[PDB]
């Protein structure tokens, strides 16, 4: 159930260029004979994608990242690749996503799985039911914390006569999948051309994903030795992995409503021109498309090299306070203060700021700060605000309408109350 598989045939990873591949309908809207520009996570044109082989005993199935998305394409003839795995650590300590394809059905689970190294689906014969079953317990050992399950029709269906391209995304709470099946006769690498991927599902798993791995099948027909890193043979099935990025595309639509072409606006200045003119044809001439701007490299922070703390302690933790009609004023100057600690302190029942927020207050310099302090009762606290009326705001302490500062108050019944 957890056998290892450590055949040792080392070959370097290959790279290929994705000429025009990975385009998918961003929304479920119909468009015809129109050019539409949209920004979304796409596979840039002529992108540097890795290449992995499974030909004989060379197997390539490492754990790869899932930074923002994946364009997964597979040239197959025997459906050797059965599914994928998604997660952060791929062990029982965290939740993980699983996608596998049984004959004429799909199994999707979000459990805390404990995958063994070099997993895979096993195929054998059962001698009852008279049919070669496909038990999946080689992939994962245990399944804890299951929350989601789902079954549907095959995602993958029938040298390489067919091409299956997939697009995976991990948007806020939805795992979105776009797929396409294209027949081709090319056997070496990706066929240059164009083909759009139609969406398939959008699973609301709502988890965090950073790594992913692929699942393949093995052939042990001609003979079967004991379970070990041997006795397995993999037919010719290779796959390419590409990471998506936020990109602005200009999409074309035909009469039918299919895409059939597109343009990556940041590929080259000619693409910038095409996107600017909202056309795939550019007439002879000069066009203004963008603006060159040199960006800063680093920040420069300069302040006087002085060292002193503002005496907020003798203002807030003062032994006695003043009456509101004779409210005391303290002028704070020539010092450095941390308003973050003041805001952090939960001794205050009222902490309202105007024209500036306290979180963005410990990085702004002022020439002078005035600290007015007094004592009022509960229902009068609301009168200490710009544009308020009452006995206190009219006759005792009035705030301007352009006030820039914070109003802080706290219940002092334990200190400012007498039994009599």
């Amino acid at each position, epitope marked *: *159930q957890c056998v290892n598989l450590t055949t040792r045939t080392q070959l370097p990873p290959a790279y290929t260029n994705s000429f025009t591949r990975g385009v998918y309908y961003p929304d479920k809207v119909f468009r015809s004979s129109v050019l539409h520009s949209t920004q979304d996570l796409f596979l840039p044109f002529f992108s540097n994608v890795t290449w992995f082989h499974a030909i004989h005993k060379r197997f390539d199935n490492p754990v790869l990242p899932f930074n923002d998305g994946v364009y997964f394409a597979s040239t197959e003839k025997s459906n050797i690749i059965r599914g994928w795995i998604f997660g952060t650590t791929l062990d029982s300590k965290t939740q993980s996503l699983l996608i596998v394809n049984n004959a004429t059905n799909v199994v999707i689970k979000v459990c805390e799985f404990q995958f063994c190294n070099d997993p895979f689906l096993g195929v054998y014969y*059962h*001698k*009852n039911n008279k049919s070669w079953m496909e*038990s999946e*317990f080689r992939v994962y050992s245990s399944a804890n914390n299951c929350t989601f399950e789902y079954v549907s029709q095959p995602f993958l269906m029938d040298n390489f006569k067919n091409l299956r391209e997939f697009v995976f995304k991990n948007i806020d709470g939805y795992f979105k999948i776009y797929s396409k099946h294209t027949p081709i006769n090319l056997v070496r690498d990706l066929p240059q051309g164009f083909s759009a991927l139609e969406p398939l599902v959008d699973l609301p798993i709502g988890i965090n994903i950073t790594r992913f791995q692929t699942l393949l099948a093995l052939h042990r027909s001609y003979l079967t*030795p*004991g*379970d070990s890193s041997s006795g397995w043979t993999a037919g010719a099935a290779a796959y390419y992995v590409g990471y998506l990025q936020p990109r602005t595309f200009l999409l074309k639509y035909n009469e039918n409503g299919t895409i059939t072409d597109a343009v990556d606006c940041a590929l080259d200045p000619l693409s910038e021109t095409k996107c600017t003119l909202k056309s795939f044809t550019v007439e002879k001439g000069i066009y203004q498309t963008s603006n060159f701007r040199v960006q800063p490299t680093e920040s420069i922070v300069r302040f006087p090299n002085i060292t002193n703390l503002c005496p907020f302690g003798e203002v807030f933790n003062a032994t006695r306070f003043a009456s509101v009609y004779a409210w005391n004023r303290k002028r704070i100057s020539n010092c450095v203060a941390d308003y973050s600690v003041l805001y952090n302190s939960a001794s205050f029942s009222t902490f309202k700021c105007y024209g500036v927020s306290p979180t963005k207050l410990n990085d702004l310099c002022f020439t002078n700060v005035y600290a007015d302090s007094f004592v009022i009762r509960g229902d009068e606290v609301r009168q200490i605000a710009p544009g308020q009326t009452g006995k206190i705001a009219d006759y005792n302490y009035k705030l301007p309408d352009d006030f820039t500062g914070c109003v802080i108050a706290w219940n002092s019944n334990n200190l400012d109350s007498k039994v009599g």
Partner: antibody, heavy 115, light 106 residues
Framework: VQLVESGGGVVQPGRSLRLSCAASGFTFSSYGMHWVRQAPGKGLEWVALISYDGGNRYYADSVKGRFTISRDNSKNTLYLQMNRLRAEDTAMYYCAKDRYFMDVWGKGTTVTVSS | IQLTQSPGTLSLSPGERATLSCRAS???????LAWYQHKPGQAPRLLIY???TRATGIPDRFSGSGSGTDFTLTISRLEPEDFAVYYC????????FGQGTKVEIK
């Protein structure tokens, strides 16, 4: 990962006794299951094995024709039917899961063949 | 396949080195040779498989060697918990066990 045997006790020579092994905590239907016995103060003696799917069975030479091993994958149970018992079959019989070798062993059921 | 273990009884003290042997009447296929530990009143516990592969949780003072008909289990620095009966087993052609070696305190 737990195996609990049952059905032990005293049985008169020549009569029959059926042992059972209840499994939980693992994918029972994907493992071959063995029976092993150990006479008091003596060594381990393999008795029988049944494949994960119940298609293949094998028995020790000393019990061929007399013992039958079976399993029920829907109920996570393995059974050992012991017919025509001899005084020399008295032992503790262990239920054990195949990993091949056996990596999970039950506590064993004591079978005494006596009048 | 008959497995003959030797010696019948081994008497040592903690800290010493123990060597246990297992001989098969026929060559073991695929190095399918396993070692088991048994304490009184306890079920057996897997120590070694594949002639040389340590089982999960087994400390590195246990090591297995040998091939063909001749196999050895070595315990490099005996601990008090290591005093027990040891059985070898072949699983390449049916399933047969040795008669056991008792490792006792001298």
């Amino acid at each position: 990962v737990q195996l609990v045997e049952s059905g032990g006790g005293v049985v008169q020579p020549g009569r029959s006794l059926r042992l059972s092994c209840a499994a939980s905590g693992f994918t029972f239907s994907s493992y071959g299951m063995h029976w092993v016995r150990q006479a008091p103060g003596k060594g381990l003696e393999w008795v029988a094995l049944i494949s994960y799917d119940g298609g293949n069975r094998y028995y020790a030479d000393s019990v061929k024709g007399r013992f039958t091993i079976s399993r029920d994958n829907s109920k996570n149970t393995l059974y050992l039917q012991m017919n025509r018992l001899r005084a020399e079959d008295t032992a503790m019989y262990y239920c054990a899961k195949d990993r091949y070798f056996m990596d999970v062993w039950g506590k064993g059921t004591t079978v005494t063949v006596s009048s | 396949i008959q497995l003959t273990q030797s010696p019948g009884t081994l008497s040592l003290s903690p800290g010493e080195r123990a060597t246990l042997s297992c001989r098969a009447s026929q060559s073991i296929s695929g190095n399918y040779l396993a070692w088991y530990q048994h304490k009184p009143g306890q079920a057996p516990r897997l120590l070694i498989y594949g002639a040389s592969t340590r089982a999960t949780g087994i400390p590195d003072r246990f090591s297995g060697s040998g091939s063909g008909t001749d196999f050895t289990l070595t315990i490099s620095r005996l601990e008090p918990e290591d005093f027990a009966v040891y059985y070898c087993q072949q699983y390449g052609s049916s399933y047969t066990f040795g008669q056991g070696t008792k490792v006792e305190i001298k």
